[PDB]
């Protein structure tokens with residue numbers, strides 16, 4: 197809850213700005229997040245989690261049709277209830 | 279989005295925003311470049327090189343001179359000192 | 362005149378050539394020592410980079426990238442790695458003996474690594490004020506090792522090493538309030554005696 201300043205680098209997470217746009221790097225944990233001025237979340241994620249992750253950005257597999265596997269794990273046709 | 283999504287694949291595009299009549303928003307002094315290096319040579323920087331072999335990232339950045347100094351683009355002549 | 366020696370005793374401490382212990386908890390990458398200093402060719406550019414090392418703990422695995430003869434050999438995580446071999450391989454040498462990684466690079470340069478954190482570079486009589494960085498200048502004068510990159514002595518080392526970070530946009534460290542007890546030993550007088 198304590199508002200901190202920026203940049204900020206605690207716990208292996210470097211919270212920096214790049215090209216006038218804000219970045220959060222987690223290279224130790226294998227990800228890079230950022231935001232632009234307009235507000236557009238982006239997540240670059242390492243192939244280590246190939247076939248492993250599952251969330252709102254779908255699984256990091258090759259296929260692009262099966263990546264609605266719910267928190268239980270259910271291929272749901274709907275992009276909404278998912 | 280379509281610009282970046284192609285760029286991530288290994289094939290980048292260029293100057294498409296020139297005629298699109300839409301540039302992404304950025305603060306004063308900068309506007310949207312495409313494929314600027316992340317290691318923006320700023321004002322209060324050490325002049326070292328060939329460590330920043332990172333991939334190239336899109337975003338807005340200063341003009342050719344006009345080094346960065348605290349979130350704005352300021353001319354290289356007026357680089358301050360710090361103590 | 363004898364052969365001086367930097368050191369990193371623990372996680373965040375630094376001993377200069379002329380001999381000056383000072384405290385500097387950092388998390389960015391920093392210029393430990395180099396030759397490219399003012400009006401010199403700039404042969405070698407030993408660097409150091411720590412991560413999660415403002416507070417010493419089981420965290421803070423160091424990274425070290427040493428830049429000599431246009432090469433890129435670096436180390437961390439127990440082993441050393443050649444990212445770019447250098448030209449004059451004749452001077453190159455690695456002596457993995459005992460607990461250390463003894464590492465020569467030339468006539469007047471040698472590095473030692475405990476495999477864990479310590480960085481003990483050894484320079485010969487050659488230089489005698491031809492270097493600068495976090496270890497000072499190697500001049501014999503012991504109270505001018507805090508000559509920041511903007512060419513002035515600073516009194517407070519936490520501001521000093523901030524002048525020697527590579528990425529000029531990462532997070533510079535914070536001026537800690539001074540006390541005799543670190544965070545755990547703070548108001549833990551019992552433990553504070555047992556550690557003592």
Ligand SMILES: *[C@@H]1O[C@H](CO)[C@@H](O)[C@H](O)[C@H]1NC(C)=O
Nearest residue numbers: 246247248255256257258259
């Ligand atoms: C993903 O993991 C599952 C379960 O271990 C395995 O059956 C499947 O072959 C894996 N698929 C890929 C693309 O690695």
Ligand SMILES: [Ca+2]
Nearest residue numbers: 255259260263
């Ligand atoms: Ca998928």
Ligand SMILES: [Ca+2]
Nearest residue numbers: 497502505506
């Ligand atoms: Ca000195």
